[PDB]
C-alpha cells in the first residue's frame, strides 16, 4: 500500500514571561516515532518507536539542531504576525506547521505538502505542484511575494521530492516488523433491549492498524443511515485503533440487518449478522 512521513509543529506565545511553548511530533503512517517538547529537561529530539533507536549520535545531534531552528522561526513569526494583524502584546497566539511526503505501493514519490496556520486558520501553503503558494489574506500575500523573491518553494520541493522520500524508505525497511504489518479489525456484534419492542445492534471493530476503516449498515441488502450512530475512530493506547456503528431495529427483526467492514488488512470485506 501507499505510505507517508509527516511532521507537526505547534508554538503558543507566553506574553507574561519567556519564550513560546513549542511541541514537535513526527509520524510514519499512523505511528509516532519522534518528539521535541520545549518544557522537557533534555532539550533533545527524543525517540518514540523502537526502530528509530538504532540511529547513531550524528542523527540525534542533527535533528535536535534543526528542530530548535524550527522553534526560532516560529518565535520570530509570532512577533511578525502580531504586527501584520495590529494585535496587542497582551494575548496568547498560535502558529501550526505541517509538512511531509507520500509514496505509492512502489515506494516512489507520489505527492508532497507544506501548510501553515495562525490562530487555527489557514495562512499560507504550497500548491499540489510544490512550485507556487496559496495565500488566504493580504498579510499572507505579502509573505507570498517575499518567498517568491527568495525562491523558497524550490528549496522546500528539493526536500519533499528527494530527502523526505529517502528517509521514509529507510524507516519502512528498518521498522518492517510493525510498519509493513497490517492488523485487520477484530469484529463482534452486541445487542441491547431499549423496550419490549425496539433493540440496538452495535457492530465493533477493535485492535486494527492502520486507522482508516469503513463501517456500513444494510437492511435487506440496502444501505441504511436513518436510526444509526457511528463514533469517531479512537486510539486504543497500544498503537491500534477502535470504532463502532449502531442501528435501532424492531425487536424480532434483527436478522434483516448486516454490518459491512472494509479495511486494508481484510482480503475481502467482512459481513456480520445477529
Amino acid at each position: 500500500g501507499s505510505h507517508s512521513m509527516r511532521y507537526f509543529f505547534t508554538s503558543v506565545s507566553r506574553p507574561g514571561r519567556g519564550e513560546p511553548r513549542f511541541i514537535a511530533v513526527g509520524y510514519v503512517d499512523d505511528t509516532q516515532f519522534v518528539r521535541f517538547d520545549s518544557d522537557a529537561a533534555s532539550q533533545r529530539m527524543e525517540p518514540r518507536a523502537p526502530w528509530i533507536e538504532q540511529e547513531g549520535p550524528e542523527y540525534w545531534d542533527g535533528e535536535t539542531r534543526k528542530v530548535k531552528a524550527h522553534s526560532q522561526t516560529h518565535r520570530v513569526d509570532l512577533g511578525t504576525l502580531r504586527g501584520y494583524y495590529n494585535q496587542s502584546e497582551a494575548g496568547s497566539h498560535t502558529v501550526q506547521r505541517m509538512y511531509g511526503c507520500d509514496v505509492g505501493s512502489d515506494w516512489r514519490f507520489l505527492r508532497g505538502y507544506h501548510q501553515y496556520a495562525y490562530d487555527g486558520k489557514d495562512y499560507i501553503a504550497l500548491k499540489e505542484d510544490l512550485r507556487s503558494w496559496t495565500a488566504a489574506d493580504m498579510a499572507a500575500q505579502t509573505t507570498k511575494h517575499k518567498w517568491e523573491a527568495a525562491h523558497v518553494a524550490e528549496q522546500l520541493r528539493a526536500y519533499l521530492e528527494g530527502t523526505c522520500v529517502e528517509w521514509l524508505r529507510r524507516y519502512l525497511e528498518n521498522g518492517k516488523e510493525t510498519l509493513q504489518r497490517t492488523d485487520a479489525p477484530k469484529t463482534h456484534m452486541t445487542h441491547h433491549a431499549v423496550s419490549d419492542h425496539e433493540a440496538t445492534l452495535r457492530c465493533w471493530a477493535l485492535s486494527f492498524y492502520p486507522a482508516e476503516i469503513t463501517l456500513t449498515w444494510q437492511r435487506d441488502g440496502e444501505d441504511q443511515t436513518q436510526d444509526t450512530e457511528l463514533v469517531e475512530t479512537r486510539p486504543a493506547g497500544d498503537g491500534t485503533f477502535q470504532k463502532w456503528a449502531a442501528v435501532v431495529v424492531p425487536s424480532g427483526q434483527e436478522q434483516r440487518y448486516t454490518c459491512h467492514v472494509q479495511h486494508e488488512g481484510l482480503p475481502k470485506p467482512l459481513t456480520l449478522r445477529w
Binding site: 517575499k146 522546500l156 528539493a158 528517509w167
Partner: peptide, 10 residues
C-alpha cells in the same frame, strides 16, 4: 528526518 534546508520567516 526533518527539513534540512534554509529556513524563512513570514
Amino acid at each position: 528526518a526533518v527539513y534540512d534546508g534554509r529556513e524563512h520567516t513570514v
